[PDB]
Amino acid sequence: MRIYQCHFCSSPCYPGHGIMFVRNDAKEFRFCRSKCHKAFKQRRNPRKLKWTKAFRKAAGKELAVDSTLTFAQRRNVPVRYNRELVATTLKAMARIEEIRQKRERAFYKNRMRGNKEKDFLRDKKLVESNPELLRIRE
Amino acid sequence: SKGQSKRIWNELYKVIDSSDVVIHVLDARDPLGASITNSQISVGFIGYPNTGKSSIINTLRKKKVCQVAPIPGETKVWQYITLMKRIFLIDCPGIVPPILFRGVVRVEHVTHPEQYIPGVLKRCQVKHLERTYEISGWKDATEFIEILARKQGRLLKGGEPDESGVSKQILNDFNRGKIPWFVLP
Amino acid sequence: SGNGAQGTKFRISLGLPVGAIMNCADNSGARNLYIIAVKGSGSRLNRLPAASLGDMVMATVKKGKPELRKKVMPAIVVRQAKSWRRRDGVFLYFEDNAGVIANPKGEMKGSAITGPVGKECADLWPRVASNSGVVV
Amino acid sequence: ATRTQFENSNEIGVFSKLTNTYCLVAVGGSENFYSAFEAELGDAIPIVHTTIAGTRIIGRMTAGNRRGLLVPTQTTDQELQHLRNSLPDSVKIQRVEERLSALGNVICCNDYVALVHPDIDRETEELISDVLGVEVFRQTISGNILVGSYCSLSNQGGLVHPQTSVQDQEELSSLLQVPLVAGTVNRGSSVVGAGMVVNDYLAVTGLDTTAPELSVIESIFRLQ
Amino acid sequence: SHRKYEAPRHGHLGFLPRKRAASIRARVKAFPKDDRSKPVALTSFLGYKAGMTTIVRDLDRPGSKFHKREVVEAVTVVDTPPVVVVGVVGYVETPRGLRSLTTVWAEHLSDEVKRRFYKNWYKSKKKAFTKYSAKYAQDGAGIERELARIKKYASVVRVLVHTQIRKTPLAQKKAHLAEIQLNGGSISEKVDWAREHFEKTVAVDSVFEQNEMIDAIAVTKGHGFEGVTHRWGTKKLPRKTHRGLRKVACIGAWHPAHVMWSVARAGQRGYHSRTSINHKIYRVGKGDDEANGATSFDRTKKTITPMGGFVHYGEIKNDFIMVKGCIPGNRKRIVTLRKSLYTNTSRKALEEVSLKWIDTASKFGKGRFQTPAEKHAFMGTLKKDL
RNA sequence: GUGAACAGCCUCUAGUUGAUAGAAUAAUGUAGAUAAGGGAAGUCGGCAAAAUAGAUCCGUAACUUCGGGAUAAGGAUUGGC
RNA sequence: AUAACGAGAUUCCCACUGUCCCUAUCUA
RNA sequence: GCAGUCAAGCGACAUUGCUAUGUCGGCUCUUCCUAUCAUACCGAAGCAGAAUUCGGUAAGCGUUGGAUUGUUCACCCACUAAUAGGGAACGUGAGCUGGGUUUAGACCGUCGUGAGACAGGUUAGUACCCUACUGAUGAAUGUUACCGCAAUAGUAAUUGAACUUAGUACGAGAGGAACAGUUCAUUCGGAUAAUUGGUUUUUGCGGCUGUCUGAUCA
RNA sequence: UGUACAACGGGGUAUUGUAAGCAGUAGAGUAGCCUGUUGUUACGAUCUGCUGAGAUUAAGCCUUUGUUGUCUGAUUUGU
Ligand SMILES: [Mg+2]
Known part of the structure; x- marks a missing residue:
């Protein structure tokens, strides 16, 4: 078994889902669902589509580089399948997932910080410019 | 491979029976293998398609009595033609033996x-x-x-x-x- | 299955019916193949014989070196270009449908094959795999 | 020299790979093919029932020597794990992300020298050189692009397809630093590389191999 | 006239007439051989279809080219909550076929089966078993007489069981009564075992098990009045034929002067009871065990139920049986599971099905995540979070 | 108004709400469409459908009664600011 | 007594397409 | 067949030389016959194996896609186990096709003084009634409801490949099998949306053109 | 007259694709005042941040610790 990352969205592609394309260049492209496959068939650029992870990574909407992401790699060199190592990896994956979620939440908070001041300023502008409405209200 | 069939081979024997003499009207390009404006006894015309049978009939009558075209498929059947009420002209459809x-x-x-x-x-x-x-x-x-x-x-x-x-x-x-x-x- | 097959054939979607044109994938000099019939297909009323990846078909070369034209020889399809069910659980399809020409014994006319070669064809035909520089 | 057969395929090289320290065979069919190697190899070197990308052509999808083994991208993680478990640490296993997955046909190599398809990028060439620890050169046998299918090599000698010219034979012998002979296998089959598998002390070919072919194989490979 | 061509007849003639089934419950026709050398056990079970899902199984089929490979395939999920015995039937052989001797009911019955005996239940006084319950007690004799009569003359014993509909997500609230023949020990042992189970519940793992082969019997999907083209697969006329083109043009010859019954006229399609055999059970689930959809090759503590629930069906929440292939009938439909009915010894039956991974992605669309945790990890925090 | 145009569509002045209708969307029909791979292998027969359609620029063969073929054929562009 | 032109008759090539392989869906 | 040959009976078997004047055809459909092409089971053949010939019962199934005839005449390519022969008004016009035949116009050849005809070739042409069948309601059975038996009618599976047997028996060589066990596929039949393909009136979500609501939004 | 039913609302799962509005030292370029040589103030398709935002969600998707409403309308049946 192997979950594949969508070429157009990087989303996990579980077995028996989506469509795969093989070109004369002797490489394979996997699409999670028909939407991504149709978008690719139109020669669209994922970096210019807002609903694909490529744009978010390029646009900086989410943490693009982090230390946690270094754990996940294509292990071209296998391991001898030690029983203790299996349990250690099982615990480490959960710990890394929790840490990555915390870091992503922190990054989102840092990106969204300051919206409160803008909202307060907009409310002040709306209140100041509508005296008659307030007078009629009370 | 075409130009032969039972319905086509039948006409040749019919014209032979209905004709008393056969004259060579084969193509002059390959002797080793006739225009309208320039050039009772039944005479039958024998030759391959696009040889001149229809053209030779037309030039004798000095008019387009018989259909003439470069395509071999001139006609699958023959008809009687007469000139001066002296000799009857019959042209068999072109047949190519195997x-x-x-x-x-x-x-x-x-x-x-x-x-x-x-x-x-x-x-x-x-x-x-x-x-x-x-x-x-x-x-x-x-x-x-x-x-x-x-x-x-x-x-x-x-x-x-x-x-x-x-x-x-x-x-x-x-x-x-x-x-x-x-x-x- | 015809001679040269070393196992059972998987059930896959029919991509090339009779008369379908498939590009060549060998250095034999041919460029396109015209399918006239499919070997091993059970003919049924109104049902045009159709091949698929790894199938052996009889075809006549339409374009390429004239020496190979007007003669019918067995050909093996290397690319289908129609989605087929892979047991690994992926609906994969190739960019262009293509085939190769070989004798009934399975020996490849061309010394080598160009471009990707379907897994279901290389696995079933040892000679195709040996003469193919790319699989999948 | 020993005669054997796959289920019914005489192309032993397609369904098996043999080296000086390990052997690989297809899992499909029965154990008759597996037992044939045991009669000659016994338990001296490992014999692994392994598949590559779900195919039985593992003999042509993978290439390697006593120092390492290479597999294409299509190989699943399960196959890589099984190969790692079933082979000693002295035999390296390295996944290869090259465009041409036909490692067995693209790469023809022995314990000292290797030949690769020129289209292979220099990165994969360096990876092959480091993992296998052998000299790697871009060469073809008289225009035969697939060196791994039209040539067989070993520390004792090598064999190429008959169409190889005298000049090509001399050049390849000089490059590989081993004797080479142009001939056929499996009763005139020109695909020598896929027809049979050979190592420094054991050559296995299909039943169709004629007596002159077996004698030539034994003489060139110095098996007796 | 030999018509110059021979073609197979469209549609199997054995599945006629193609009329609607008389009940949504597909009654079982034949039970297994009923060899009395084995312990008493049930022969069938009642379940409700709960959609389907995909499975990846490490095929170990020897000889096949998929040996030791990984193959993805479809599996159907049927909601099979525990079943409760509510009576027994004693059958006595007669020259005119099997005949029902007498029926004995339990001491008390749940409202689910009492509801099955009324069509205006909300208006009903609910007098289901007012006197029968009174007859059961105060002597312990009237029922015992019926039990003795059954023991004396009965030949095959059938247990009256009904599904716990209230446990299922269905809003039906009505149970389905069914007769299940008792196999195993002698008829006296059969009735003794059934008697001890009065008002009790029977699980599903005691009847079926992993790797077991079962036969699916249920009413197929209804489609109403259908044209012959789809009803029997008749080929369409070329184009714009007079008086229609989607119908069989020639119906019969002058002699005979009547329309042959086999000329495949148009009519009702679907809703016909069908029987399928050789269905291998892939997994037996329990509602009290967490991680029902987990596997030794997955480790994920997730239920088989897809994200957001099934389509047109609720959450399993009970015991369920996983079977490969497709089962007749649509979702949330009552389907009866029956044994193979014969001593199957094919290697497929002997095969052991150890699931590698179970698909629990949402069936509501192009699902990309197996559990909400994966979706949260991928998408991350959203605006609504803060 | 758009548009070369009284081509096609919307709007102002002016004039109409007249064609028995309520519920459902069974088969089969009438009118109009979409479709993975092959692209006529169907049929008596390319029957029907489809495909190019306006404008700007390059280019345009055989024949010819030199007037035509010709918008031959085949190619590049078309929005907004 | 043969150019152009044709709701004239027939053959063929590119594009094309549910005529077909094999039918399926929608709208009034 | 012609002209002989001898001869059990009242002339059998054997025996001598040579030797198209019509329109029916095709797409779908159901059923029936064996005079068996293929499949099951057997006997005889120089059957050593392999392959093949004939013969016996057996109709369940299967008996095709194409170059090509309007065609009646009827010939080829390829797959497949094989591509067997026939009937039901040589079934099937209120089923279709009018393809061909056959009105009213017209063109070419023969004759006919003429109108016209053909030995002829071409062109264009106007069920809503009853029953049967497929589906579907229904009064009377003391009422309703549930669970059951089955008189009866129909009936289905079909065929080839792949591993082991085994390069083993057989065989001088060439080559080359049984059985049993195991794995797929061809045709057909019953289901079903798990995955993928297809449909968009979810007019669900976005964009595009003309026009209109003063502009934005809508 | 209660794990009772129905209309909404809250979540889960999906479809599409970043809504109105605000601000920008992004924005090819063209103009008033001035006096540069990042002048400033105006027009400016687009782009940037709020904003994986906005909208729909069953008419045949799952759930509902909430709000509101409903629960005696006619006929027939006898050994
Ligand atoms: Mg002529």
């Missing part, structure tokens, strides 16, 4: 006309076919087909020359005698 260079098979229905371009090239010298179009000193006859297609503007979508159509037209013109050729005695 090809494309001869007026036998229509070039339209052939799926692979390109391979016959070397055949026509063999019959005629370089200059004789060059004088027909005079486009280049061609070599690699496929290149000759492409050159003729470009000269005549016979190109498919994208810009590729129409090799099949150009070859078909070349063979059709060869059937008309546009490119002179003859068999040495």
